[PDB]
Design a protein around this ligand. Structure first.
Ligand SMILES: CCCCCCCCCCCCCCCCCC(=O)OC[C@H](COP(=O)([O-])OCC(O)COP(=O)([O-])OC[C@@H](COC(=O)CCCCCCCCCCCCCCCCC)OC(=O)CCCCCCCCCCCCCCCCC)OC(=O)CCCCCCCCCCCCCCCCC
Ligand SMILES: CCCCCCCCCCCCCCCCCC(=O)OC[C@H](COP(=O)(O)OCCN)OC(=O)CCCCCCCCCCCCCCCCC
Ligand SMILES: CCCCCCCCCCCCCCCCCC(=O)OC[C@H](COP(=O)(O)OCCN)OC(=O)CCCCCCCCCCCCCCCCC
Ligand SMILES: CCCCCCCCCCCCCCCCCC(=O)OC[C@H](COP(=O)(O)OCCN)OC(=O)CCCCCCCCCCCCCCCCC
Ligand SMILES: CCCCCCCCCCCCCCCCCC(=O)OC[C@H](COP(=O)(O)OCCN)OC(=O)CCCCCCCCCCCCCCCCC
Ligand SMILES: CCCCCCCCCCCCCCCCCC(=O)OC[C@H](COP(=O)(O)OCCN)OC(=O)CCCCCCCCCCCCCCCCC
Ligand SMILES: CCCCCCCCCCCCCCCCCC(=O)OC[C@H](COP(=O)(O)OCCN)OC(=O)CCCCCCCCCCCCCCCCC
Ligand SMILES: CCCCCCCCCCCCCCCCCC(=O)OC[C@H](COP(=O)(O)OCCN)OC(=O)CCCCCCCCCCCCCCCCC
Ligand SMILES: CCCCCCCCCCCC(=O)OC[C@H](COP(=O)(O)OCC[N+](C)(C)C)OC(=O)CCCCCCCCCCC
Ligand SMILES: *C(=O)CCCCCCCCCCCCC
Ligand SMILES: [Zn+2]
Lengths: 55, 64, 128, 55, 174, 88, 459, 55, 156, 122, 171
């Protein structure tokens, strides 16, 4: 793993372009877990808490 | 001097209170302090009764 | 081409990738300019009081008052018992209550038999 | 516990391969190391998990 | 002594005599010697002075003894005067039993710590006593409810005996 | 925070020191008062790079609603001065 | 109990015969002396209760509710000194008279050995409570609040009156001590189903039970500060105290009659906790918190185990100090901004550093941080309901999550963030305000050291 | 410090009646530890300084 | 002290009413859209877009910077749910549908592989490690009475 | 492991099941099978408070090592020789429990030959 | 509303930042920043107004598809790691009217100086009100920004909070 780290690290120094992938965005945004759960459950809970439970 | 005072009011005084508390109010009641009995081994003498535990049998051991 | 952005209630359409800002219509400019009028007229009212040194207290905000009034006091006088409200109330109010009754009632009947028979482990159970 | 730790030691480490913020990188490292401890408890080596805790 | 030794038994201790092999010293021994010089002795003086004062004006508090009274089984129906004394005594015995169980539990936990890694074998009679008393405790006081009383306790007992006698009676017919 | 406070003279010196490695503005012509469209005639998109150059020099990033309004090396000092409470 | 009744009556002459400028000082001082003397009720024995006379007695259930009651009266007088500042003297001395008369009915209610004497004083608390709400409320909705608070209670109290009298003609006595020895089991017949409901629905409404709670958001929100404090601190516990007594004579029918009221409580516990997540009124949010917390008391009382009763008693006392404290904290903000909207004044921790500490301590007890008695009471009910049904842990665990969410949300929407720019009249915290909070929390935190005195008769 | 706990775990994990997939996740994660660790060193100790001028 | 002519009211069923409602709420009559008159109690309260307060210009000079509102601006029916401490609706770099597919797929495969790795364990070649005295019968809490069937292990 | 591929991808009735290790008849098959001796019989093991699992056979080796540690304190670097002795004894014990693996594995490849011999006899 | 000029300028500002985040290294940023700078020059001479919009709607789309999933943010901006980190220290200025004399005397110069500003505002306020009402359409104000000081002595209307806003680094 160490060798692959340096070899991949040096590849960034090359002046080639980059292709936004899906794994990279999957790893970048924490696997999307803190973008659906942190935006869906608050919406489901805080919408039921108002339109159904209270109103 | 700063440490001598600190070791006095923050270590010596609290340990006096705790030892007095443990030795005359905690230990005077059953099972408040319970000690895991010491690990006894063959070839030792018990300080309290003078009992001696026979050593283990001969070892059929080898080198290396 | 690229997969066009698809919106959702939790992910709005980006302003850039929206076919609504680039077009410059006669009614749009005279409208978007009109929104900034009231949006600045109200700021003037707030700006005057916010700075008046002969003023101590709280600036009553009618928008805030209207917001809380509709959330609490104006709901009932605008409620009509219809198909949607009745069905929603029945399955949101009675549904959970009936569901949990059978969950617990089934379990306690199951436990009672295992205790009356003696087939349940209560060897050390003396705190209840 | 073994499986729970095994996924955690992988998923969080994967999220750390593309993270930028230094604290975030070290944060996901703790999650991966915590997952490694859970793996230890899942293989019936509790003291090794304790040993890993102190070190 | 402070606590009775027949209630809280403790096996006689056995501290192994030190048999050092290394030439280096034992800093624990020095700290042990230092501890009982700067801590134990200064503390021991203060207790002795306080001990002397307590000895100058000794006074005694006694352990209240409750005269036995007729039990609920000997009380007529709806006789509050006889029921009252029967119920109060039952509640007192209930509190004593709640502490007998705590004594056996306290002994059980005491053994487990003392025997260390050998608790699963050495601590076997303590568990046996604990299992027996809890069985006795559970039979008398359990499933009575928040509004427990002697009457409910009596009715539960008479339910258990009927189950036993019917089983015993039909046991002979096997 | 252990960072020495920025002095008013320090900001202006830094601003010109930024606008002297551009290779597109004459070092002998640019001063505290030097427009980018009316005096030395610089490209509009070069302002964005000029603004970006300032942000990478001072840390804080200027909004793209008043940064556009800044084409006067002195005015960049004016904006940066009234974003770090520098009075001397 | 005359040693506490007569002093309470003598506060009324004290208020009326005191100097025009010393009504608050004298009433507050002598009310604190009565509270101090109430500590003598703790002479409790392990087998018998402290039976004073044919009329009054005090056991381990009544004693903690008596001390909280007599301790609450001094604190209600401090809280009322602000909004009763431009009020004329005669009406100020009438307001104090109503508060004193309410305490007098309460201590006698908690010690009445006869269940019909309990009923009369139980209902007698409505009159002064209604007068406080409707005569010294600030809003137009106070008039409607009193009607809801009055007819919800009487809709359930009158059936209780019939049931209590029917029991006397059957058993022969409503004296509580006699019932402990003459109680007979209840058969499973339709007649006894409605005898059960009549004896219980009078207390479910006051707890309140979910479904029968619509009066609380209207009464606790429109009442003055003193009314809200007593309404949520003691008067809700009148329902709890009633069940703990009258459930003695309802076995074994409580085994199945309690199912509909455990689902309303267990589920209604989640619903009302959820409502607090979206409330736009700080006082209303606290009112719905009482409904969520009192849902646990109903469950504990209806499952009838030694651990449930111990938890219920500690929960009732724990909630009494916490709920009263939260109302006082919310009123200090109101006395400045004069608006109950929660999103109107923010970032108050920047302007009132010490009052924010009280907010934190109040919120932590509300969410049952151990080892506070808030947690001890809630924990014991959770242990007892687990044995009642292991699946209940799901409902009482979800409630814990929601309780922490709306309690800290309340602490974040008002104390943290950015201060409101256009609000410039947030003056520093008066000594009266700070001392009012310290009296709520210090006894609440002190009871942790010796909590056996609030664990009820089954300790 | 870390070898005396971390490595002992892998030896016990590999040589135990364990879950095959869980074992593979632990080993893959260990490799990921070197990759993001090298990310911290390379991007904050080696190369040329990307930080501003007056620091 | 606001009268019942500046507060919310019933649904508007005529063009004239909609105009007054828009003026009441400080909105452009064309931008004022009442909630559907479904009888759930919304009345004539404007249905503003379901946009989070996080989706507002952070650089503009707000009257309430923390909430991002202007004094007098009509407030969203769910403003307390769309404050910056709660539900956010800002655009995401990856479409919502695509994110759920990938997250669901990752979790689904991972659990399946744990199940596959559970029925196919990975052990080393060893035997039933031996212990003395009838498999530590007396050490393992066994009853001293009723001694077990002799269990004995031989060399190899 | 390596034989796992032989039991999951390859044949099944050749490798011995770790949870079904030899149920074949008793020591019969190897003439004069002995009994492994125990040094710390019952009380010596239950006097050093050895862990329930540690006292397998090398308890005497472990007891000897623990004696040195209690004595060599504070010389923790010492007793390295005794630890190796205890480790080596368990190393032999590991191979002994490892011989039973191949021992039964070959006893299975031998048991199939008779099974296949009779199957194909006709 | 933004102008078609600004939208292109904004998209150029974002592109370099997002481009910078991908490159990390400064040398590779220059090699790629210029190429992006070059591509704008291609259509910089465009004067169609119907195909410039067409490309812009494809310029934003091109940017969106390749935007960084974690763009660098300066640590005091709307999204940085120190945004509003000091808002808890930004106490208002009106709070000093509530200080006790026993602690107001701690700074005799400060509060003697304060009365000057209150006088400078109390006397100036009426003039500031007059100036705004006389420079506004009869219907009402139509935009933001306010007239500056016209004559001498008068300060800009609505200046107190702008001038006296809490210092951005109170402590
Ligand atoms: C008797 C007490 C007399 C009060 C005297 C107070 C005083 O004059 O000093 C001024 C003292 C310091 O003055 P200050 O510097 O201006 O700070 C006040 C500011 O508001 C700033 O306050 P703050 O934000 O720094 O918060 C301080 C407060 C709270 O700070 C916190 O840390 C938040 C609470 C988290 C605690 C969680 C830990 C887990 C607790 C369980 C472990 C036990 O600290 C404590 O409550 C005690 C430390 C926790 C123990 O003021 C305070 O600390 C707050 C007021 C006093 C509150 C007392 C609450 C505890 C009293 C308990 C007494 C009964 C024993 C209970 C035992 C059972 C435990 C549950
Ligand atoms: C493993 C977990 C991976 C995540 C899987 C859960 C995904 C849930 C989901 O996708 O529902 C989201 C739903 C989408 O509906 P939406 O497009 O936002 O509304 C119509 C707008 N045209 O929007 C909603 O939230 C509606 C409620 C869905 C309940 C789930
Ligand atoms: C349970 C009953 C379920 C009823 C569902 C269907 C009702 C229905 O469709 O009509 C109800 C009626 C509306 O009439 P409809 O023909 O549907 O069309 C509109 C005409 N105005 O609407 C009505 O005016 C009659 C009222 C309908 C019944 C109301 C009571 C049930 C629904 C409310 C649930 C209450 C929840 C209480 C929760 C307590 C526990 C917490
Ligand atoms: C047993 C009970 C023992 C306590 C007796 C009750 C305590 C009563 C409270 C203390 C008295 C009080 O309320 O304080 C008032 C009094 C000073 O008030 P005063 O002198 O009247 O000031 C105006 C004079 N023109 O205070 C004093 O004069 C105290 C000196
Ligand atoms: C145990 C279980 C507990 C169950 C509790 C169920 C709920 C109990 C009833 C709660 C009543 C709520 C308060 C009364 C409603 C109210 O506030 O009044 C509203 C309405 C307005 O009328 P009004 O005030 O006179 O004129 C406007 C003046 N500004 O008032 C009116 O227009 C009419 C008011 C009617 C009078 C109220 C009656 C109270 C309920 C008892 C009615 C009798 C019961 C049935 C009698 C036998 C059968 C007829
Ligand atoms: C909302 C709508 C609520 C509708 C409530 C309807 C209640 C009226 C029907 C209940 C009638 C109950 C009753 O009358 O019981 C008669 C029973 C006779 O007693 P007894 O002679 O001893 O019977 C022996 C026969 N072998 O008497 C008894 O044994 C027990 C009598 C107890 C007193 C019953 C009090 C009425 C019950 C009210 C239920 C609670 C309602 C709360 C809301 C207010 C309404
Ligand atoms: C908004 C209103 C809020 C106020 C509501 C007030 C409460 C509502 C009235 C409740 C009345 C009591 C319920 C019982 C009615 C009389 C019938 C009865 O008592 O039957 C008893 C029956 C005995 O038979 P059995 O079940 O076999 O015995 C062993 C059980 N352990 O044993 C049983 O059958 C068990 C009990 C049956 C009850 C089932 C209830 C299921 C619904 C629970 C949620 C309640 C929903 C309330 C709806 C409000 C609208
Ligand atoms: C959302 C709906 C969730 C409620 C679903 C109720 C299902 C009840 C059920 O079927 O039993 C589940 C569980 C199994 O426990 P078990 O030991 O197997 O005994 C059999 C009991 N039926 O019964 C239990 O013993 C309860 C287990 C409680 C687990 C709590 C987990 C909390 C998660 C947060
Ligand atoms: C013995 C066990 C195996 C040992 C070897 C480890 C496994 C091989 C992979 C290591 C190399 C690596 O993942 O590289 C990590 C690289 C490094 O960032 P970069 O994109 O190169 O540079 C970043 C800057 N850019 C983009 C401008 C050049 O990030 C990636 O590619 C992003 C995705 C990482 C996770 C992909 C694997 C997860 C698969 C599971 C489902 C998501
Ligand atoms: C027995 O259970 C072996 C388990 C080991 C799993 C890791 C295998 C790693 C092999 C990588 C290839 C190395 C070839 C020299
Ligand atoms: Zn006020």
């Amino acid at each position: 793993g160490f060798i692959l780290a340096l070899e991949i690290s040096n590849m960034t120094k090359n002046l080639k372009y980059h292709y936004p992938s899906n794994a990279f965005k999957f790893s970048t945004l924490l696997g999307y877990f803190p973008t659906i759960m942190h935006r869906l459950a608050p919406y489901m809970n805080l919408s039921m808490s108002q339109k159904s439970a209270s109103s | 001097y700063r440490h001598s005072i600190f070791a006095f009011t923050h270590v010596l005084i609290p340990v006096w209170i705790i030892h007095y508390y443990l030795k005359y109010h905690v230990t005077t009641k059953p099972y408040t302090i319970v000690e895991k009995k010491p690990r006894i081994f063959p070839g030792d003498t018990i300080l309290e009764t003078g009992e001696v535990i026979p050593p283990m049998k001969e070892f059929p051991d080898q080198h290396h | 081409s690229f997969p066009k952005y698809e919106a959702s209630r939790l992910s709005s359409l980006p302003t850039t990738l929206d076919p609504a800002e680039y077009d410059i219509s006669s009614e749009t400019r005279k409208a978007q300019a009109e929104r900034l009028a009231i949006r600045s007229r109200l700021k003037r009212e707030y700006q005057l009081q916010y700075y008046d040194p002969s003023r101590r207290g709280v600036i009553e905000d009618p928008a805030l008052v209207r917001w809380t009034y509709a959330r609490s006091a104006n709901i009932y006088p605008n409620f009509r018992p219809n198909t949607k409200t009745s069905l929603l109330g029945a399955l949101f109010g009675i549904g959970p209550l009936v569901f949990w009754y059978y969950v617990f009632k089934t379990d306690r009947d199951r436990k009672e038999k295992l205790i009356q028979e003696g087939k349940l482990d209560r060897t050390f159970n003396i705190s209840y | 516990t073994l499986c729970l730790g095994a996924i955690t030691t992988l998923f969080t480490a994967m999220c750390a391969l593309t993270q930028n913020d230094i604290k975030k990188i070290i944060a996901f490292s703790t999650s991966s190391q915590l997952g490694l401890m859970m793996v230890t408890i899942g293989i019936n080596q509790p003291y090794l998990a304790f040993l890993h805790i102190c070190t | 002594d402070s606590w009775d030794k027949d209630v809280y038994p403790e096996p006689p201790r056995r501290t192994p005599a030190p048999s050092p092999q290394t030439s280096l010293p034992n800093p624990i021994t020095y700290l042990t010697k230092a501890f009982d010089l700067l801590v134990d002795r200064p503390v021991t003086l203060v207790r002795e002075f306080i001990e002397r004062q307590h000895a100058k004006n000794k006074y005694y508090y006694y352990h209240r003894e409750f005269r036995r009274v007729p039990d609920i089984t000997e009380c007529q129906e709806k006789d509050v005067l006889c029921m009252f004394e029967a119920e109060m005594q039952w509640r007192r015995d209930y509190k004593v039993d709640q502490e007998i169980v705590n004594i056996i539990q306290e002994r059980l936990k005491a053994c487990q710590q003392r025997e260390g890694e050998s608790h699963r074998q050495n601590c076997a009679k303590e568990l046996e006593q604990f299992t027996q008393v809890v069985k006795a405790y559970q039979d008398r006081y359990h499933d009575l409810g928040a509004h427990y009383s002697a009457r409910k306790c009596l009715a539960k007992q008479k339910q258990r005996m009927l189950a036993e006698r019917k089983a015993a009676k039909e046991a002979a017919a096997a | 925070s252990d960072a020495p406070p920025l002095t008013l003279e320090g900001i202006k010196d830094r601003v010109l020191y930024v606008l002297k490695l551009y290779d597109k503005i004459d070092p002998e012509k640019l001063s505290v008062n030097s427009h980018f469209m009316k005096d030395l005639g610089l490209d509009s998109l070069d302002q964005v790079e000029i603004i970006m150059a300032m942000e990478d020099e001072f840390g804080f990033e200027i909004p793209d609603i008043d940064a556009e309004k800044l084409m006067c090396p002195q005015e960049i000092v004016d904006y940066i001065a009234d974003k770090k409470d520098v009075y001397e | 109990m005359l040693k506490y009744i007569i002093p309470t009556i003598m506060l009324m002459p004290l208020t009326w015969l005191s100097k025009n400028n010393m009504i608050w000082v004298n009433s507050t001082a002598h009310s604190l002396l009565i509270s101090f003397t109430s500590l003598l009720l703790m002479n409790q024995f392990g087998d018998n209760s402290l039976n004073f006379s044919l009329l009054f007695f005090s056991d381990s259930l009544s004693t903690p509710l008596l001390i909280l009651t007599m301790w609450l009266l001094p604190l209600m007088l401090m809280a009322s000194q602000h909004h009763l500042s431009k009020e004329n003297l005669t009406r100020k001395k009438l307001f104090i008279t109503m508060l004193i008369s309410l305490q007098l009915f309460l201590i006698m209610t908690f010690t009445a050995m006869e269940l019909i004497l309990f009923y009369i004083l139980f209902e007698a608390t409505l009159v002064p409570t209604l007068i406080i709400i409707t005569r010294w409320g600030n809003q137009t909705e106070r008039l409607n609040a009193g009607l809801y608070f009055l007819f919800y209670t009487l809709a359930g109290s009158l059936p209780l009156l019939v049931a209590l009298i029917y029991i006397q003609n059957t058993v022969g006595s409503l004296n509580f001590l006699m019932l402990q020895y003459w109680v007979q089991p209840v058969h499973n017949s339709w007649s006894n189903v409605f005898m059960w409901l009549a004896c219980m629905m009078a207390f479910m409404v006051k707890m309140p039970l979910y479904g029968l709670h619509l009066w609380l958001p209207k009464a606790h929100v429109e009442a003055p500060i003193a009314g809200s404090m007593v309404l949520a601190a003691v008067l809700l516990k009148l329902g709890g105290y009633g069940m703990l007594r009258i459930t003695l004579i309802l076995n074994p029918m409580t085994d199945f009659m309690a199912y509909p009221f455990i689902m309303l409580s267990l589920w209604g516990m989640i619903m009302t906790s959820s409502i607090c997540l979206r409330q736009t009124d700080l006082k209303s949010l606290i009112a719905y918190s009482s409904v969520s917390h009192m849902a646990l008391v109903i469950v504990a009382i209806l499952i009838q185990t030694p651990w449930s009763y111990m938890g219920a008693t500690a929960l009732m006392i724990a909630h009494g100090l916490t709920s009263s404290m939260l109302f006082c904290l919310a009123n200090s903000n109101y006395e400045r901004i004069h608006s109950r909207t929660m999103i109107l004044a923010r970032g108050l921790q920047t302007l009132l550093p010490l009052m924010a500490t009280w907010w934190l301590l109040a919120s932590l007890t509300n969410l049952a941080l151990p080892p506070t008695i808030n947690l001890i009471g809630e924990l014991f009910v959770v242990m007892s309901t687990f044995s009642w049904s292991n699946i209940t842990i799901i409902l009482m665990g979800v409630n814990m999550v929601i309780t922490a969410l709306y309690s800290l949300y309340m602490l974040i929407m008002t104390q943290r963030g950015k201060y409101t720019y256009h609000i410039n009249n947030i003056s520093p915290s008066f000594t009266r305000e700070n001392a009012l909070m310290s009296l709520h929390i210090l006894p609440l935190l002190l009871l942790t050291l010796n909590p056996k005195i609030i664990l009820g008769p089954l300790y | 410090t870390g070898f005396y706990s971390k490595d002992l775990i892998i030896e016990a994990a590999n040589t135990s009646y364990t879950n095959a997939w869980a074992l593979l996740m632990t080993l893959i994660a260990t490799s990921f530890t070197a990759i993001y660790s090298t990310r911290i060193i390379f991007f904050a100790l080696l190369g040329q300084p990307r930080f501003p001028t007056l620091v | 002290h606001i009268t019942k002519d500046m507060l919310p009211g019933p649904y508007p069923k005529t063009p004239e009413e909609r105009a007054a409602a828009a003026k009441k709420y400080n909105m452009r009559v064309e931008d004022y859209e009442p909630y559907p008159d479904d009888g759930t109690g919304y009345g004539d309260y404007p249905k503003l877009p379901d946009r989070s307060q996080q989706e507002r210009d952070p650089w503009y000079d707000w009257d309430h910077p923390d909430l991002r509102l202007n004094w007098g601006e009509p407030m969203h029916w769910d403003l307390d749910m769309y404050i910056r401490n709660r539900v956010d609706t800002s655009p995401t770099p990856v479409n919502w549908n695509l994110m759920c597919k990938h997250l669901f797929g990752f979790v689904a495969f991972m659990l399946f592989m744990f199940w596959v790795g559970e029925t196919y364990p990975a052990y080393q070649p060893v035997g039933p490690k031996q212990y003395p005295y009838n498999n530590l019968y007396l050490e393992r809490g066994g009853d001293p009475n009723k001694e077990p069937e002799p269990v004995v292990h031989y060399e190899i | 492991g390596a034989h796992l591929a032989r039991r999951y991808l390859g044949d099944a009735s050749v490798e011995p099941d770790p949870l079904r290790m030899p149920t074949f008849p008793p020591d019969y098959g190897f003439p004069e099978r002995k009994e492994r001796e125990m040094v710390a019989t019952q009380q010596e093991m239950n006097d050093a408070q050895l862990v329930l699992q540690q006292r397998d056979y090398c308890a005497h080796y472990l007891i000897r090592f623990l004696k040195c540690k209690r004595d060599s304190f504070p010389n923790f670097l010492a007793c390295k020789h005794e630890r190796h002795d205890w480790d080596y004894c368990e190393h032999l014990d590991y191979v002994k429990r490892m011989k039973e693996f191949e021992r039964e594995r070959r006893l299975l490849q031998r048991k199939k030959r008779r099974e296949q011999r009779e199957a194909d006899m006709a | 509303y933004l102008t078609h000029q600004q939208k292109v300028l904004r998209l150029y500002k974002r592109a370099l930042r997002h481009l910078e985040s991908w490159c990390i290294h400064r040398d590779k940023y220059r090699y790629f920043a210029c190429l992006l700078r070059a591509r704008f020059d291609e259509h910089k001479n465009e004067k169609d107004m119907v195909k410039a919009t067409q490309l812009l709607r494809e310029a934003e789309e091109e940017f969106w598809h390749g935007q960084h999933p974690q763009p660098y943010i300066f640590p005091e901006s709307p999204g940085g790691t120190s945004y509003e980190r000091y808002e808890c220290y930004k106490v208002p200025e009106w709070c000093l009217d509530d200080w006790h004399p026993s602690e107001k005397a701690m700074y005799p110069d400060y509060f003697a100086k304060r009365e000057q500003w209150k006088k400078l505002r109390r006397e100036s306020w009426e003039r500031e009100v007059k100036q705004l009402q006389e420079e506004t359409p009869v219907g009402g104000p139509r935009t933001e920004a306010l007239p500056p000081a016209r004559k001498q002595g008068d300060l800009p209307p609505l200046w107190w909070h702008i001038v006296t806003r809490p210092r951005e680094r109170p402590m």
